[PDB]
Symmetry: C3
């Protein structure tokens, strides 16, 4: 497997087989154990990595940096300003220049087309740290986390529901991943925000080969029944207009993950997941503005759920690093 | 070493969180690490550690000190600047703390209310170091006391007399007063009464000082405040984050507390040394300093160029010592 | 030259002799070989470098970072905001503080006077990563690249033309460098944008000693006749007001490097160079806005040229790193 991943880009899970994805998750677990044991071998010694961010990030950027450092690599962070990218230099040119100096490149930003163009022109591995359409490294971490908290199930045995805006990058990626791994995923939200028809048809085609199931529904009780995990994300994503809150809060509010939703699973051990950052109280400037305008306290999840014993969001966040490390080691390591 | 043991895994949020002997230990360790770097004998005690540096205010010395100290000790760093991350607009400090705590071995924070750094320190689960808040600037004062010891030819801190002039209730004034009380020093806070430190903080420091033999004097009178001082210290009259409307109201109030050569002469001490945490407004070579001094027809604000560039000024030794003392804090808490 | 380069600042090519510049070029080639062979020895192990940027950068910043990393050094990037520089703290004070903590300092920004002040006060080597007036590290990379693509010619044997805005940092530095190395350079552009007369005079004096030739001309046909390389750069530089485009497109467009200009060289082996970033199509926001407004496809260079077999811009861009490495190794190693 390892050999088959060296020099690969990591642009989207549609580009990877079931067994490649399982391999990456297994490698993540091995690297995690090694870091905890003090026995990590540095497979990226002497390698230099460029991290391009055109959107804000805490987890993803930090995960890249720490993963690189632990593995012996050095990093250059190219933030939303300070470089020539976009205003003064094309992505084809930036890809070719960075490919001359760096051993691998991460990109977070806007359209998937941009990352694909980087991936085609750079000549070194390119990794997608989030695009408007997909967020592949997040789902690797999510699946590692589900396996850790399931105590001996395979992925193909796990049932989970994603609530809210199912057509954002995280919803898209969860559906693709669930299909690839034979899981039972429910997307529970307003029909206007279900994923793109062609993406759903592609994933259903995949799911019929892997034994996976994909349910779209507006009905919370039906969607969440028997779930091991409940997942949600912000209702308006980076780059979108705040006028979207006016269009969406009324449609999404029934899909807020609150204690009643956990109770509707019927599963006393239900675990709550969120990719983060989350709006669960008034301790952010945006969350407070939205909550005040619409008369809410927490948006996609309440404080009571987010801070409960059912919440595994910080384990999930940690696993961003271990899984990003696995991607870099598989694609760039010795 | 008992001090070393009790310091492992601690935050460094404020000097009020450390004993007199712990603070002495950190100063002593700083001197050892300084000697080691100069001799080429420094051992890397932070090999494989990763540190996150959160900055919500600008910085040259503190940022650079944390980076170089980490680098020298074998650690790697992530700088998380005023924007580019999810902090504050999209993610709470409690959440940020817990996430960073999962990935990094230690975290620096520079920013606004002390309450924020305290929250980060409670929630992170790894050492959190305060690189400046509105209320306190603890790493600065470690550097200052190492510098005073290096320039005092064998005197202990408990033997040193010093005055801080100007805005005595800013972070550095607050911290100098706590540090002086801890270490048994004689400190005079010299400034307008409205800018004296909070009465509750003064009372806490007077209690600390009674057991160490320290002395705390608050006065508006410069000549009585500086008599006999080994060191004179000042800082800008308007601090980061305060409204810049304050310059109009404060320059004329604070101008009597400018450190100039007459003030040095009022000490009556030919060996007097001048200290400033930096950055300093001492001429027309900054945009802000030039605009505010020109408004009053002044050449320099809190300190003159004549004092700042004199043989009495030890500000660049003090600046260098920011690195060696931040190194001690990180080695003690994570080494 | 080894003894002579240790602890030096690298503020402008005017400060270096012909032999020192050739030594840096030769060292860059040796370091490039070592990285490609996997034999690179770390001569900056344990050194810490500060990188101050008051203007944007992709190549220069990345070059300094990768060069340092490869050589065992660590770096602090101090970007256009986040520090106390300028508004709160003087450059004399900044220099002195950074000199206490770091082993070397890079500066990219505005007036050359600022970098000179930093180099006078820091007490450690200071390197100019671009100023309004000069861009010395670029020209090292450019001359390394010419030597690689000239089939055994020496620099003193090479003829080249720079087209467009001759008084920008890159035009200035190419003229200085051409003078130092005995080259035949033509600066080809509108006379309002020819380099300062005092700098031209200084370069002519240098050229008299080295056998170099410096020509200023508005004539493209004559200017490019026989050249081995054609070089251009954007018509409006960082820190200039965007209103400059309206003045300069009409004056500069006859100096666009297009396939007809390459043809006018009479040289089937002519190669095209550009410091980058370049406006050669509509795939940047500034480039698209300006070109669309003026009915053009590409500004200083066309796509047809830039993506042609004659274009060596990515080799040149790579060479930014190997040449910055040499500057650091020579001055701090
Ligand atoms: C990690 C952030 C994911 C969110 N859907 C967004 O794109 O903002
Ligand atoms: C190091 C800066 C200290 C100053 N009192 C401020 O807070 O701006
Ligand atoms: C490397 C950029 C060169 C250009 N003359 C500028 O100053 O913008
Ligand atoms: Cl994906
Ligand atoms: Cl609830
Ligand atoms: Cl304090
Ligand atoms: Cl004076
Ligand atoms: Cl030059
Ligand atoms: Cl053409």
């Amino acid at each position: 497997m390892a050999f088959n991943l060296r020099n690969r880009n990591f642009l989207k899970l549609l580009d990877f087989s079931t067994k490649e994805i399982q391999f990456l998750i297994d490698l993540s677990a091995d690297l995690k154990k090694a870091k905890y044991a003090g026995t990590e071998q540095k497979k990226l010694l002497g390698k230099n990595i460029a991290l391009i961010f055109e959107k804000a990030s805490t987890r993803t950027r930090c995960a890249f940096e720490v993963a690189a450092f632990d593995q012996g690599a050095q990093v250059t962070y190219i933030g939303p300003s300070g470089s020539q990218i976009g205003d003064k230099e094309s992505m084809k040119d930036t890809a070719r220049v960075l490919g001359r100096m760096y051993d691998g490149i991460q990109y977070r930003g806007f359209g998937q087309a941009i990352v694909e163009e980087l991936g085609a022109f750079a000549g070194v591995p390119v990794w997608n740290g989030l695009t408007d359409e997909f967020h592949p490294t997040q789902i690797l971490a999510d699946f590692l986390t589900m396996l850790e908290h399931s105590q001996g199930k395979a992925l193909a045995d796990i049932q989970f529901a994603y609530l809210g805006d199912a057509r954002n990058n995280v919803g898209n990626s969860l559906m693709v991943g669930a299909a690839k791994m034979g899981m039972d995923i429910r997307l529970v939200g307003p029909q206007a925000y279900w994923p793109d028809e062609e993406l759903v048809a592609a994933c259903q085609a995949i799911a019929k080969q892997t034994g996976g199931k994909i349910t779209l529904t507006e009905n919370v009780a039906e969607g969440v029944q028997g779930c091991d995990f409940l997942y949600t994300d912000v209702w308006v994503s980076m780059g979108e207009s705040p006028e979207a809150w006016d269009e969406r809060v009324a449609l999404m509010k029934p899909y807020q993950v609150n204690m009643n939703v956990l109770k509707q699973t019927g599963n006393p051990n239900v675990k709550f997941m969120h990719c983060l950052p989350a709006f669960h109280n008034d301790e952010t400037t945006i969350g407070k503005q939205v909550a005040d305008k619409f008369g809410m306290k927490g948006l996609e999840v309440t404080e009571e759920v987010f801070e409960s014993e059912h919440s595994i969001v910080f384990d999930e966040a940690e696993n961003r690093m271990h899984t990003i490390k696995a991607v870099m080691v598989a694609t760039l390591g010795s």
